[PDB]
Amino acid sequence: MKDFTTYLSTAPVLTLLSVTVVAGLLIEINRFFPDALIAAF
Amino acid sequence: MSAQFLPSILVPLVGLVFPAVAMASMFLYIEKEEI
Amino acid sequence: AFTPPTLQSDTPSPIFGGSTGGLLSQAQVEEFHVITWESKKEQIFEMPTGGAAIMRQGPNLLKLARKEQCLALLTQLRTKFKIDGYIYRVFPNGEVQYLHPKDGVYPEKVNAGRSGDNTNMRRIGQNKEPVQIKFSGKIPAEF
Amino acid sequence: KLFPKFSQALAQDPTTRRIWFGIATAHDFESHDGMTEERLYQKIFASHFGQLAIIFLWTSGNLFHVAWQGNFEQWVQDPLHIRPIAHAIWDPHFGQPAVEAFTRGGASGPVNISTSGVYQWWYTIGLRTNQELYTGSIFLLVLAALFLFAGWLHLQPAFQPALSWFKNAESRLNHHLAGLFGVSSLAWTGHLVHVAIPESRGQHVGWDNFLTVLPHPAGLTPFFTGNWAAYAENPDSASHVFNTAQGSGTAILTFLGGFHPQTQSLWLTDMAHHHLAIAVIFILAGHMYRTIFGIGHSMREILEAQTPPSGSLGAGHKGLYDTVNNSLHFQLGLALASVGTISSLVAQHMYSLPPYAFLAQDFTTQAALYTHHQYIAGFIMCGAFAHGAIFFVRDYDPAQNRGNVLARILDHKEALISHLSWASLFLGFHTLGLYVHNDVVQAFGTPEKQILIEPVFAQWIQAAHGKTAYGFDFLLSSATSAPSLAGQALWLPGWLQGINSDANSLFLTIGPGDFLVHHAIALGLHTTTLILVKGALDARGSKLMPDKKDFGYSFPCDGPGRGGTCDISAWDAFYLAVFWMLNTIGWVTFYWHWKHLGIWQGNVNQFNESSTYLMGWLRDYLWLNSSQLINGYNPFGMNSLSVWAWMFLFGHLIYATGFMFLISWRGYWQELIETLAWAHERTPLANLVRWRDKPVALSIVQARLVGLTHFSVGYVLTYAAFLIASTSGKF
Amino acid sequence: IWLSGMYFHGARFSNYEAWLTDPTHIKPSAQVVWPIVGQEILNADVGGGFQGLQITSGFFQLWRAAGITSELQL
Amino acid sequence: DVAGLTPCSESKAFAKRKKNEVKALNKRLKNYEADSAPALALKATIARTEARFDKYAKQGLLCGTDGLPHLIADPGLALRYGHAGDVFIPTIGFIYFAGWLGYAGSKYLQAVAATAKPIEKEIIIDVPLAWKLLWEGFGWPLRAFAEYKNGSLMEDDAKITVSPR
Amino acid sequence: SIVIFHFSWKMQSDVWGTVSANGVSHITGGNFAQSANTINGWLRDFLWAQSSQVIQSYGSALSAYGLIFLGAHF
Amino acid sequence: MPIADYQVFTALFLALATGIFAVRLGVALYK
Amino acid sequence: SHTVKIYDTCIGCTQCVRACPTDVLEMVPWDGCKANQIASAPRTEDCVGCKRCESACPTDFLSVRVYLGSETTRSMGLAY
Ligand code: CLA
Ligand code: CLA
Ligand code: CLA
Ligand code: CLA
Ligand code: CLA
Numbered sequence A: 001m002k003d004f005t006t007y008l009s010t011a012p013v014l015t016l017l018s019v020t021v022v023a024g025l026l027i028e029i030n031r032f033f034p035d036a037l038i039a040a041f
Numbered sequence B: 001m002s003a004q005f006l007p008s009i010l011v012p013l014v015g016l017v018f019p020a021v022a023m024a025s026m027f028l029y030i031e032k033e034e035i
Numbered sequence C: 001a002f003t004p005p006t007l008q009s010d011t012p013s014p015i016f017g018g019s020t021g022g023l024l025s026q027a028q029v030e031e032f033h034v035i036t037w038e039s040k041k042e043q044i045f046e047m048p049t050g051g052a053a054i055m056r057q058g059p060n061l062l063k064l065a066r067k068e069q070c071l072a073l074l075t076q077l078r079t080k081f082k083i084d085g086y087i088y089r090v091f092p093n094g095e096v097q098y099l100h101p102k103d104g105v106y107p108e109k110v111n112a113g114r115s116g117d118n119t120n121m122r123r124i125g126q127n128k129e130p131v132q133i134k135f136s137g138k139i140p141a142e143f
Numbered sequence D: 001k002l003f004p005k006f007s008q009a010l011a012q013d014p015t016t017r018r019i020w021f022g023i024a025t026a027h028d029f030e031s032h033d034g035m036t037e038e039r040l041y042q043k044i045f046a047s048h049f050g051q052l053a054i055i056f057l058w059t060s061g062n063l064f065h066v067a068w069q070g071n072f073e074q075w076v077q078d079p080l081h082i083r084p085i086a087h088a089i090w091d092p093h094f095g096q097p098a099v100e101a102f103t104r105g106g107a108s109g110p111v112n113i114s115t116s117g118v119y120q121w122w123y124t125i126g127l128r129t130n131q132e133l134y135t136g137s138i139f140l141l142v143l144a145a146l147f148l149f150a151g152w153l154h155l156q157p158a159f160q161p162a163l164s165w166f167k168n169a170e171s172r173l174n175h176h177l178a179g180l181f182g183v184s185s186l187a188w189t190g191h192l193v194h195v196a197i198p199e200s201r202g203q204h205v206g207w208d209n210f211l212t213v214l215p216h217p218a219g220l221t222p223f224f225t226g227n228w229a230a231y232a233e234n235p236d237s238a239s240h241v242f243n244t245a246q247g248s249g250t251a252i253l254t255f256l257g258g259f260h261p262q263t264q265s266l267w268l269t270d271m272a273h274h275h276l277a278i279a280v281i282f283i284l285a286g287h288m289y290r291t292i293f294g295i296g297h298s299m300r301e302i303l304e305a306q307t308p309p310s311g312s313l314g315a316g317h318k319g320l321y322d323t324v325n326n327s328l329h330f331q332l333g334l335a336l337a338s339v340g341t342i343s344s345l346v347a348q349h350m351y352s353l354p355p356y357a358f359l360a361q362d363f364t365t366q367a368a369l370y371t372h373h374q375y376i377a378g379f380i381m382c383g384a385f386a387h388g389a390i391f392f393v394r395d396y397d398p399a400q401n402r403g404n405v406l407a408r409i410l411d412h413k414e415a416l417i418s419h420l421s422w423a424s425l426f427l428g429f430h431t432l433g434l435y436v437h438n439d440v441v442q443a444f445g446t447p448e449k450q451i452l453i454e455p456v457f458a459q460w461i462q463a464a465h466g467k468t469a470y471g472f473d474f475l476l477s478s479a480t481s482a483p484s485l486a487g488q489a490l491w492l493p494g495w496l497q498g499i500n501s502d503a504n505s506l507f508l509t510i511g512p513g514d515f516l517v518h519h520a521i522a523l524g525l526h527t528t529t530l531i532l533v534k535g536a537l538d539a540r541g542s543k544l545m546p547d548k549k550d551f552g553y554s555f556p557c558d559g560p561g562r563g564g565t566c567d568i569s570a571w572d573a574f575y576l577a578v579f580w581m582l583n584t585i586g587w588v589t590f591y592w593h594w595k596h597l598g599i600w601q602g603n604v605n606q607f608n609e610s611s612t613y614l615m616g617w618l619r620d621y622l623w624l625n626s627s628q629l630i631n632g633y634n635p636f637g638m639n640s641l642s643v644w645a646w647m648f649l650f651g652h653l654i655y656a657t658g659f660m661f662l663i664s665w666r667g668y669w670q671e672l673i674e675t676l677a678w679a680h681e682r683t684p685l686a687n688l689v690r691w692r693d694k695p696v697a698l699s700i701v702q703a704r705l706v707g708l709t710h711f712s713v714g715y716v717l718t719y720a721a722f723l724i725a726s727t728s729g730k731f
Numbered sequence E: 001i002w003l004s005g006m007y008f009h010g011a012r013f014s015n016y017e018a019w020l021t022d023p024t025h026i027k028p029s030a031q032v033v034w035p036i037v038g039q040e041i042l043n044a045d046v047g048g049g050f051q052g053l054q055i056t057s058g059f060f061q062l063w064r065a066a067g068i069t070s071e072l073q074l
Numbered sequence F: 001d002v003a004g005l006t007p008c009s010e011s012k013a014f015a016k017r018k019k020n021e022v023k024a025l026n027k028r029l030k031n032y033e034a035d036s037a038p039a040l041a042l043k044a045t046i047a048r049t050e051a052r053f054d055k056y057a058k059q060g061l062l063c064g065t066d067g068l069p070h071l072i073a074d075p076g077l078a079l080r081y082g083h084a085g086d087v088f089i090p091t092i093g094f095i096y097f098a099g100w101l102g103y104a105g106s107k108y109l110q111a112v113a114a115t116a117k118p119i120e121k122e123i124i125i126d127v128p129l130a131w132k133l134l135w136e137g138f139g140w141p142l143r144a145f146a147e148y149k150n151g152s153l154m155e156d157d158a159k160i161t162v163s164p165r
Numbered sequence G: 001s002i003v004i005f006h007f008s009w010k011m012q013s014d015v016w017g018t019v020s021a022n023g024v025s026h027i028t029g030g031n032f033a034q035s036a037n038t039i040n041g042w043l044r045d046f047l048w049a050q051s052s053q054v055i056q057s058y059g060s061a062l063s064a065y066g067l068i069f070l071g072a073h074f
Numbered sequence H: 001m002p003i004a005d006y007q008v009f010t011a012l013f014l015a016l017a018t019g020i021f022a023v024r025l026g027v028a029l030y031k
Numbered sequence I: 001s002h003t004v005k006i007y008d009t010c011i012g013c014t015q016c017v018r019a020c021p022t023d024v025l026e027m028v029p030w031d032g033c034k035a036n037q038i039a040s041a042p043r044t045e046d047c048v049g050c051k052r053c054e055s056a057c058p059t060d061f062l063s064v065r066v067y068l069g070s071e072t073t074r075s076m077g078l079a080y
């Protein structure tokens, strides 16, 4: 376990995981708030 | 134009005679060994 | 003192089947090299011009074109065979030099009695500036 | 083996390298054996004389060919319906159809149609017949002979000038500012007033009768009485017909501004007055420096007093006079920078403010002249930076230049390089990102999601010039403002009339596409400058090679040690920056050509909507306009555009060849050539022939030069073919 | 894993059963995209009352040559 | 209007573009039973397009000679014309988020530099520490201005290595 | 690349097409036999001509192929 | 009125003279 | 005919002389370092320019330094 979590902290896996999380977040934001051209508040 | 014959003589001179002669002279000079 | 050995021309050559990488016209106009060694057993070695030859018992002689081929062959011998050889330079008029084991001792070991040619006693940036040596037919690192 | 007479090191080379390097080092006099400063300066001076002889012979040849084989007399009568002829074609490989297809502008045989705009220039400056062109050609031929004789004369020890004569900078500046610039433009004004102006109003003024013609009806009395305004009495009417006397006028020094209505060019009296003002200003400027008459300036003292207190600049400009004066590469870099920027100025003004009659009317000439001068300027800028790098490697003395602005700018080079890197990274990231975003949202059929920033700063500046299209109503666009009230009686009528009309190129309307393209141009300039500046500053030594100045300006590498040091010299920085200069000038010329190709067809919309995404550039510009060009020759025959189609493919071939030298490197080629040498020394009937020079593969730096030369020549030829065949085909 | 993906996409997100009946006019497809940023346009009007990307891997012809004729077998 | 650009809610070309794009999607609809999955997808697409065109008209974006929204990149000439959401507000938003990520990374570097094996803590990230610093990075304007007014943000060039001129 | 260019042009010019009850009407019309003899023939009758379907693909289902075509150029 | 043949020939002869001056200057530079 | 120089930062580690493939560098007695040996380049006529000597020196900056110059048959490495 400790070594498995160390493996999950490696740059190859953590980078890929973070890119996946940020990509998913942008995809969700664009799915619910689409076609937003300006910061209309 | 005037002197219609003149290009027919000058063009071969500059594109054939002059290049061959210049290249021969240049190749003789760069290999002249003692200038 | 040390006395470089004499090139014995009548020496057996390695068993080799002929190659297309041997001498060329440069060995008849400029100069070529000869390497001589002594083999403790008849064994297969890799001639630097492609292919494999067999070195025979006792003295062996082999002539190449460039010095660097001879030294590559000698490095092969020193590493994989522990055999020590001598490299002579043959001119086509008959003159023979003696090259690599110049002082009998190999270049990596201090011989005490060697010439310290081309040894500046300054660092690398302690050389002169090119503007100061302008129009001199030399480079900053030989002043 | 004695060809490189100037280099003993290369003479003893047993290989073919001795030839190659023996050519490429023939003009680097400072590197020649046994070379003194005196001899260097004298050889340079004579070489300059040879260069001017070349220039005069080239212009004389242009004049002679137009006079002999050109249709100048015919072109004068119908300047808009006649295609100007360059020179005749005599080629014995032509088929009959090609001879048919190249007989164009009325000439008896095949001819080339001129795209240099020399017809318009000679027509504007007063030349009307072919006898005048022939007289100019003969005069210029004699002048070139005279300059050649002077160049030989000053190589002689009886006439060889001393080295201290060359370094005399104050006298040289006095004479170039006052004499080469001032009096030359004064005499040009004299020609304009005495010849070009009267020849523009139907009157013939020549060598025969110029002493019997008054340029002004009350000649020379207003000039010497101060009544100078009498020389601008009645200008050219708005219905004036060029070359004729239909509403001509008598004013010789007018200041109307704007354009001639018929020629769509600058008024000729405007240019005469221009050159008069320039002459006066430049003569005054030429009386600034001190020679032998006890008045004037010592430039050294000026430089020594430009040191700000508080020491923000350090020692100020202490030691810059000697630095510039002693180094010829510093002077060459300064001159190259100035000349290149002025070439860009010439290109950018001559299209918006065309100075020659019936220029801008002809469209291929406009594009050709603009692209020509833009490419010339780009190359000259690369050369200016290359010679700055050479100055740093060769002629820079830290001890003399200690604490001055040169040392201070070498001190913090990392700030400069890092900030150029940031600016270029920002511009590239963002311009590419906006282009890709527009391109993707267009690809998904929703062009309304495009990020279309408006160039409000450039639109605002356009509005400041009197362009009442964006409603800024700012400076000259406000008929009530102070600059507007000041110029409304001098220059502003014609200027505003020209600027507010969409019939010319004077201040084109700009939208989001112009914004994106200008930022692409900014990316190109910043990255090219990054490469050049970095290679100039990082030339005396890096962290990777702390003793680089010990090796010179050009060298291959520093072996494969320390990770590898390919392309480490400053020459390789110039090499890498030439590619970026080519790319940037290509962007500039693409932008200009598409903008004006939309302009000339009346279809501004094609550009204004299709230029915000890259597929618009690929499809609506490169692909669409290439239809006539690639159809020049085809299985159904050929037309006049066959030469341009062949040149198009020829440039493609040259560029593709240059990749061979750019990608493959010396090491495959050496073994290959060496196997070939074995093959030749070793084959019957050919052993009877042997090489005098040992054939060796091109050196590393030489191969980089060869690949770069092929790249540049192919780039230039391909774009020139496309431009000429895409503009002359449609217009 | 790659083959399983191919067969699963043929079974679920493909017009294979519709393409079997009229193999001459229905354009083979086996990949549909989501709505997320206007990329829905990529769903071609291939045929069979279906919308998706037009595959070119020749899997439909392969499956027909094998003799499938059902989406349960995929 | 800020520079010859009428509001898209007024521009006729903008509404014409809306019309044409919707008409294209209708032509695509007229091939499926209006209850099949392709028909539902097309109807959803048309609804999305109509919503976008109404949203753009509501927010008062500027359309040009063509029917395409334009943006203003000058504060002041966009703040006195009600167009600050075009470039200025997203400028603030970006600058903030970019600074957040940059400050989090910078502080992580400065935190793992003073450890046993700093070259090891870059290829094997310490996720709890990275996450803590990622949370602290949200106040980056405050902390960064504090470090600038303190002089601890930057390093004096007498300590940064340089090249031999 | 040259092999696949040869295959594409030869098949589109001398094999692929539609039968119109009186003869085969190939996609390009047989121009390989007369135009492939020259480099300009390849640049004009195969590479400029047949690229019309990729650069004009925006707003269609093939729009993705219009992007990659550009993107690969990058 | 096109230029006559003798004008062409005079021009070509003067060009030859100018070429002679050019070769003199070139050999001076090579020295 | 490349110019090979050895500077006093040398520590006499013998790496540069084992690296060279053409026997240009050599060990000589010295006293300005702990090993009491320095390198020397007597046979510089044989230098090809490979810079294997310069890629093996551990000193910072490098003690053995090669300056490629005039080219001959030996320097250009020609077997034909
Ligand atoms: C330097 C400018 C220049 C250029 C680029 C050309 C170019 C050309 N000329 Mg021309 N020529 C020139 C000057 C020039 N000329 C001048 C000043 C005259 C007045 C005497 C002539 C008189 C002339 C005639 C009578 C003819 C040409 C012809 C031609 C064409 C064929 C070349 C040829 O074989 O003729 C040969 C050219 C000459 C014998 C004299 C030209 C000498 C120039 C000044 C050379 C200058 C050298 C140059 C500046 C440096 C380049 C380096 C080089 C030496 C390696 C060609 C397009 C022929 C033609 O019409 O083809 C259809 C033709 O019959 N020219
Ligand atoms: C350097 C160029 C130049 C030259 C060579 C000439 C030559 C001539 N001009 Mg002219 N002119 C020029 C420029 C020039 N002009 C300019 C720039 C303008 C105004 C835009 C005029 C306007 C003009 C008018 C209106 C008239 C002439 C006339 C004449 C002719 C009568 C001589 C004369 O003017 O009386 C003699 C001159 C003087 C008594 C005093 C002049 C001395 C000046 C002020 C100082 C000289 C210094 C000067 C910088 C030297 C430059 C060197 C350079 C010439 C090589 C003559 C052949 C007259 C004519 O008869 O037409 C044929 C005539 O009426 N000119
Ligand atoms: C007033 C302009 C000017 C002057 C006087 C000089 C003068 C000099 N330069 Mg320089 N330079 C200039 C502009 C100038 N340059 C510009 C604009 C550039 C940018 C391209 C350069 C870039 C440059 C570099 C990188 C170097 C020099 C160097 C030198 C010095 C030696 C030149 C040499 O080696 O000759 C040799 C001349 C050649 C080898 C000509 C090469 C062939 C050309 C480039 C291409 C030929 C292809 C041809 C056009 C194709 C035909 C077309 C047709 C087929 C379609 C010399 C003092 C060298 C130096 O100082 O050494 C440290 C050096 O390395 N220059
Ligand atoms: C299309 C070809 C191309 C491209 C895109 C570039 C791009 C760039 N060059 Mg370059 N160059 C080129 C050709 C090219 N060059 C050629 C042929 C030469 C001659 C050898 C040079 C020589 C050259 C030099 C000498 C220099 C540059 C520099 C630069 C950088 C300038 C900064 C910038 O603009 O930021 C913009 C950044 C981009 C445009 C890159 C795009 C960002 C990517 C696409 C986003 C990533 C998306 C995704 C995650 C990608 C990964 C996916 C994948 C792994 C699955 C930039 C990245 C300069 C530099 O180093 O900058 C400091 C530098 O000095 N170039
Ligand atoms: C269009 C660009 C181009 C061109 C023309 C070439 C050409 C060539 N390459 Mg090359 N190559 C290129 C790009 C190019 N390459 C690139 C980008 C790379 C990087 C990967 C390489 C990498 C590469 C390697 C590794 C090798 C080659 C080799 C060769 C040669 C093979 C012999 C041959 O093809 O027969 C004949 C040559 C031609 C058909 C060239 C065209 C010449 C025309 C058709 C005829 C010549 C007559 C001429 C027109 C008349 C003279 C005019 C007069 C004024 C002089 C040949 C000269 C190989 C080689 O050296 O030989 C085996 C070699 O191994 N290339």
Ligand code: CLA
Binding pocket: D418, D419, D421, D422, D425, F101, F102, F103, F104, F105, F106, F108, F125, F129, F130, F131, F133, F134
């Ligand atoms: C947190 C790390 C970090 C930080 C604070 C900086 C900061 C800076 N960089 Mg830099 N950079 C980084 C990482 C970082 N960089 C990495 C990984 C690379 C390799 C691609 C680069 C490559 C790079 C170049 C080439 C340049 C800079 C430049 C600059 C300066 C200009 C600002 C800028 O826009 O840069 C631009 C930022 C990038 C080009 C890429 C950013 C990389 C990602 C987005 C950030 C990494 C975050 C990290 C992986 C996450 C850790 C979080 C933690 C919880 C674990 C600036 C001080 C420029 C300069 O010279 O200064 C004027 C410059 O030209 N950087």
Ligand SMILES: CC1=C(/C=C/C(C)=C/C=C/C(C)=C/C=C/C=C(C)/C=C/C=C(C)/C=C/C2=C(C)CCCC2(C)C)C(C)(C)CCC1
Binding pocket: D329, D330, D333, D334, D337, D338, D341, D384, D385, D387, D388, D389, D391, D392, D533, D536
């Ligand atoms: C590397 C090097 C070098 C070279 C350099 C260079 C090449 C530089 C440059 C550069 C450049 C090429 C620049 C440019 C410039 C310009 C400018 C900067 C300007 C300006 C202007 C202005 C400011 C304007 C104003 C105005 C306006 C606004 C408009 C109207 C008019 C007026 C005038 C008012 C040298 C050797 C020297 C040194 C060392 C090294």
Ligand code: SF4
Binding pocket: D556, D557, D558, D559, D560, D561, D564, D565, D566, D567, D700
């Ligand atoms: S690959 Fe060539 S340029 Fe690079 S280090 Fe080796 S020899 Fe030098």
Ligand code: SF4
Binding pocket: I006, I009, I010, I011, I012, I013, I014, I015, I016, I017, I038, I039, I056, I057, I058, I059, I062, I063, I064
């Ligand atoms: S490798 Fe460097 S430090 Fe070692 S002996 Fe050679 S020159 Fe001296």
Ligand code: SF4
Binding pocket: I002, I004, I019, I020, I021, I022, I023, I024, I025, I046, I047, I048, I049, I050, I051, I052, I053, I054, I066
């Ligand atoms: S460059 Fe190569 S041949 Fe020359 S001294 Fe160094 S290791 Fe020996």
